Amino acid sequence: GIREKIKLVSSAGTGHFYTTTKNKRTKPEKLELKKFDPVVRQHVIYKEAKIK
Amino acid sequence: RLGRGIGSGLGKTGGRGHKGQKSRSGGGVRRGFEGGQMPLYRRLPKFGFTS
Amino acid sequence: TRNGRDSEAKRLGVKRFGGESVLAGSIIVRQRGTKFHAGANVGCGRDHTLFAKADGKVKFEVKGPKNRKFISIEAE
Amino acid sequence: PKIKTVRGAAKRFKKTGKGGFKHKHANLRHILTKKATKRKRHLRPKAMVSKGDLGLVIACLPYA
Amino acid sequence: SRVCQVTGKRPVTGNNRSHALNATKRRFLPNLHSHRFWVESEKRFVTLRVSAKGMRVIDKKGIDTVLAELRARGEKY
RNA sequence: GCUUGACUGCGAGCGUGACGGCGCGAGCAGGUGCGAAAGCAGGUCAUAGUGAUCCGGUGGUUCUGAAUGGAAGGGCCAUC
RNA sequence: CUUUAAUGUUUGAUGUUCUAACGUUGACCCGUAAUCCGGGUUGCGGACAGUGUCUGGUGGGUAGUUUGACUGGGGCGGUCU
RNA sequence: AAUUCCUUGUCGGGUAAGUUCCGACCUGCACGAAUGGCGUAAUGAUGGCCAGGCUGUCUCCACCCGAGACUCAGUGAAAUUGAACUCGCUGUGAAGAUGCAGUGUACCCGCGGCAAGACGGAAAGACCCCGUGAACCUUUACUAUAGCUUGACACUGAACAU
RNA sequence: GUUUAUUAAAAACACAGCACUGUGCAAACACGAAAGUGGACGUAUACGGUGUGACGCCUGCCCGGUGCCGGAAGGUUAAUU
RNA sequence: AGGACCGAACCGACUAAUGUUGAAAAAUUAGCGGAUGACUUGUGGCUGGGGGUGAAAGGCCAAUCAAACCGGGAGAUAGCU
RNA sequence: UUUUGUAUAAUGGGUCAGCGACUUAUAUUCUGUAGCAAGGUUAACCGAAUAGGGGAGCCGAAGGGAAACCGAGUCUUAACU
RNA sequence: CCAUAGGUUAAUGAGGCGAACCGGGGGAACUGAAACAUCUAAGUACCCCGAGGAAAAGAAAUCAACCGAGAUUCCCCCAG
Ligand SMILES: [Mg+2]
Ligand SMILES: [Mg+2]
Ligand SMILES: [Mg+2]
Ligand SMILES: [Mg+2]
Ligand SMILES: [Mg+2]
Ligand SMILES: [Mg+2]
Ligand SMILES: [Mg+2]
Ligand SMILES: [Mg+2]
Ligand SMILES: [Mg+2]
Ligand SMILES: [Mg+2]
Ligand SMILES: [Mg+2]
Ligand SMILES: [Mg+2]
Ligand SMILES: [Mg+2]
Ligand SMILES: [Mg+2]
Ligand SMILES: [Mg+2]
Ligand SMILES: [Mg+2]
Ligand SMILES: [Mg+2]
Ligand SMILES: [Mg+2]
Ligand SMILES: [Mg+2]
Ligand SMILES: [Mg+2]
Ligand SMILES: [Mg+2]
Ligand SMILES: [Mg+2]
Ligand SMILES: [Mg+2]
Ligand SMILES: [Mg+2]
Ligand SMILES: [Mg+2]
Ligand SMILES: [Mg+2]
Ligand SMILES: [Mg+2]
Ligand SMILES: [Mg+2]
Ligand SMILES: [Mg+2]
Ligand SMILES: [Mg+2]
Ligand SMILES: [Mg+2]
Ligand SMILES: [Mg+2]
Ligand SMILES: [Mg+2]
Ligand SMILES: [Mg+2]
Ligand SMILES: [Mg+2]
Ligand SMILES: [Mg+2]
Ligand SMILES: [Mg+2]
Ligand SMILES: [Mg+2]
Ligand SMILES: [Mg+2]
Ligand SMILES: [Mg+2]
Ligand SMILES: [Mg+2]
Ligand SMILES: [Mg+2]
Ligand SMILES: [Mg+2]
Ligand SMILES: [Mg+2]
Ligand SMILES: [Mg+2]
Ligand SMILES: [Mg+2]
Ligand SMILES: [Mg+2]
Ligand SMILES: [Mg+2]
Ligand SMILES: [Mg+2]
């Protein structure tokens, strides 16, 4: 296994995040997706971050 | 009163079966022993705290 | 040797047969590929598991040009 | 002497109203991301102890 | 034996630990040294078997005061 | 072509396991996407791609806070 | 700020020379009818050596143990999800 | 070859015939230089081989002298032993029968003898396997540790020079 | 010569000799928590350890590996601060 | 002169027979090796169990030795019979 | 006795007599039984003392939730038909 | 050189024994963990020192929790 897990952090500042994986050889650009935020009860844009 | 003749129905083995742990003097596994596996109260995780 | 391997049987087949009364959501058959196809008041799962979408009797029928086998629920 | 409760089991099982024992589901510690959300959602609520293990639990918990 | 004549420190026993916490019995002995103390009142040198901690208390307490306790202790300096 | 439903909280009723568990699921609530709409979407034709607990790490959290106010630590949620 | 020349300071690094701790299984005196010991005198060594705590390395010298199962006996080979 | 598996290698000597021995050959499976190599007089209850002498070792045993064995008197054990009215054969059968089936044979009981069987007696099998048995021993198995060794601090001070 | 008292007396062990190595004498080393003792009332023509094993002719090549010895510039590195 | 020779005592224990419920829990009979020496022996002494001692066989250390015997932990433990 | 299976030529026993193995303490659960009953019951201790006193406590009549909390509801969730 | 060490007398006291209990100085392993290192066994067995009829402990630099308690020891609870 060489694909590495990443976390998608909401931009709303609630601190909620999702986790997924991404291929590091290709697609260097950060991942942006509109996903539901349970804290604000709305679909917002989630930004890629580092799992730590 | 086990082990007091054929007619009693519990003779010559005392209800313990044939040559198991239960038939040994002082024999038998401890509470929660599951044959070698870590028991269910160890497969499952701890939760909560006492207030 | 280099063999002697298998997987646990997944218990496929028909769970509720023709004319049996079923509740909505009850799975009728679990299969690999569409051996049966979903008909009226019958849903199809992501693994082609056919489930009842309404209460009623299970009915098997054969219709269509392909001579396929379909499962439907007659909800009285 | 007084019977000693198995302290490891006492920290994971609580007796219920009808004499049952509730425990949290396993498989939800550190490999959960690859598990589907529906699977994780079902593991979150508390569960009942099965009938087969009731005797073992009662043996470990004589005072509760 | 390994006994301080001032403080009375004597060997004590303990455990050698390890990265695996294995415990093995050991002994802790005092840092004893034979020293010739100058006693002014008798204008003489008297040799005492003292620990390094005992040396510090001799300066603080005075050479005469400690010996007075020693005579009360009957240590036979 | 346009997109992020690879949605969040749930879940009637079932399947398969001695058990731990695993699997299927209409429908409901909140927010979405594609369609003019009916509608479809809770990842991928399906069945392999995996590892319990303890211990420790990270984020969040008016849950707790050993005289009191904090805090540490613990708990819960997310997650390694 | 850099470059820093000098300036005191505070810590160290060696080297040299001392004696007074300490060492002496050097000499001499006494305890003493005594190749122990102690004291005295003296010489030599000397802030070392040596010892204590802590610490790195080494250490079958000495310990406590581990070293799987299935298996047409076992081992070997193979296998374990 | 105290080493060579193939192998009784091949050749020669010794014998009527020699898988051993002796001499060579080298193709050293898998010799080899102080974990010594090759030789070596003497020594050896040393190993192997050969010859002479010598003989009951043997062909092939015979006789004789003693001590037992046998008989009588006296004293008087032991291991073992489920119980026995304790035959052969063939077949069967926890698969090798005194005890079952069939069949045969056999008057009751001692004494001296021989050991084929009673899976005879002795000793909870030493070989094999097993137990999450035991012990000793080995090592670059694990974790330690005595010991050895390093530095800091203490015992432990002064002055000077850089 | 010695050895398995009680199934093995040998080709095994020992052996004189040989070589390597440690050891400067408060010697190394060993027995001892330590004191001390042996080594030795000896001093490298001595002692300890190791291997070989009279004598004769001789003992070749490899320091990569593992040890040991020497070096100390650099790299890394404990307690401490 | 000689860890020289032959050979009694003495000491060893190589072969064979007997014995194997032994005359004897290792011997007897007939032979055998050493027999002034690294010999043998008497009487005392010293070394103590993970220790001793060992011309080294895991030998011996009171008919017991790959860790003596006695007591204690101790009614160790024994998924085995 | 042990076994799929023993007349088995598998183990055990020469015989008799005596002795010889499921116990005890505490706690807990279940059944039976007795008492009281939404209550039941005391322990140590006191006590002329198997009485009586002692209700310190224990179990039960209310649960849900990790917990704070709420409560015949409660948790889950923003909220649950 | 005084002294001191040392030496000679004289007075008192101590020596050893003994069951358990007590305080202190040392201190296992088998075993359990179905192995085994941490842990358990267990500060038990055992060894050593000392004392008494008892010993030990003991008169708060203690607890409580904003109310209070008032040395030590022992028992029943709290509580597996
Ligand atoms: Mg019966
Ligand atoms: Mg049984
Ligand atoms: Mg039985
Ligand atoms: Mg506090
Ligand atoms: Mg070892
Ligand atoms: Mg052990
Ligand atoms: Mg096996
Ligand atoms: Mg051959
Ligand atoms: Mg020939
Ligand atoms: Mg030849
Ligand atoms: Mg060779
Ligand atoms: Mg060479
Ligand atoms: Mg060599
Ligand atoms: Mg010969
Ligand atoms: Mg001849
Ligand atoms: Mg017979
Ligand atoms: Mg037959
Ligand atoms: Mg017959
Ligand atoms: Mg007869
Ligand atoms: Mg005969
Ligand atoms: Mg015969
Ligand atoms: Mg037999
Ligand atoms: Mg056996
Ligand atoms: Mg055996
Ligand atoms: Mg095994
Ligand atoms: Mg000889
Ligand atoms: Mg012998
Ligand atoms: Mg002998
Ligand atoms: Mg012999
Ligand atoms: Mg040799
Ligand atoms: Mg080199
Ligand atoms: Mg080298
Ligand atoms: Mg001679
Ligand atoms: Mg002779
Ligand atoms: Mg001779
Ligand atoms: Mg013996
Ligand atoms: Mg031992
Ligand atoms: Mg004993
Ligand atoms: Mg014990
Ligand atoms: Mg026993
Ligand atoms: Mg039968
Ligand atoms: Mg029989
Ligand atoms: Mg018998
Ligand atoms: Mg009752
Ligand atoms: Mg009463
Ligand atoms: Mg009350
Ligand atoms: Mg509810
Ligand atoms: Mg164990
Ligand atoms: Mg008294």
Domains of chain E, by residue range, sit at 1-77
Alpha helices in E1-77 (DSSP H): 52-61, 63-73
| Alpha carbon of A49 to ligand 9 centroid (Å) | 93
**Which amino acid appears at position C17 of this protein?**
F
Domains and CATH numbers, chain A: 1-51 (2.20.28.120)
The burial class, CB within 10 Å (0-12 / 13-18 / 19+), for B46 is exposed
Whether the CB of E13 is less than 7 Å away from nucleic strand L comes out as: yes
φ, ψ of residue C63 in degrees (nearest 5): -140, 165
Strand J footprint at Cβ < 7 Å? Answer: B 19-21, 24-27
C47-CA/H66-C1' distance, Å: 110
Contact in structure between A8 and A33 (CB atoms under 8 Å): yes
Three-class DSSP labels, D37-58: HHHHHHHCCCEECCCCCHHHHH
Task: Characterize E37-73 residue by residue with b for buried, 16 or more Cβ atoms within 10 angstroms of its Cβ, and e for exposed.
Answer: beeeeeeeeeebbbbeebbeebeeeebeebbeebeee
**Method by which the coordinates were obtained:** cryo-EM
Residues of A in contact with D33 (CB under 8 A): 5, 19-20
Contact B44, D46 (CB under 8 A): no
The resolution, in Å, is: 3.5
What are the chain D neighbours of A19 within 8 Å (beta carbons)? Answer: 33
Structure-token pair, residue C54: 């309404």
Provide the Cα torsion C7, C10, C11, C15; round to 10°: -170
Residues 6+ apart with CB under 8 A from D60: B31, B32, B41, D5, D6, D9, D10
**Displacement of CA D36 from its chain's centroid (Å):** 23
**Residues whose CB is less than 8 angstroms from the CB of residue C23 and which lie 6 or more positions away in sequence, other chains included:** C52, C55
| Tokens (6 digits) for D48 | 């009942």
User: Where are the domains positioned within chain D?
Assistant: 1-64
DSSP 8-class letter at C60: E
- Given an 8 Å threshold on Cβ–Cβ distance, is B45 in contact with D12? yes
C-alpha span between E4 and E58 (Å, rounded): 13
| C-alpha A24 chain-centroid distance | 15
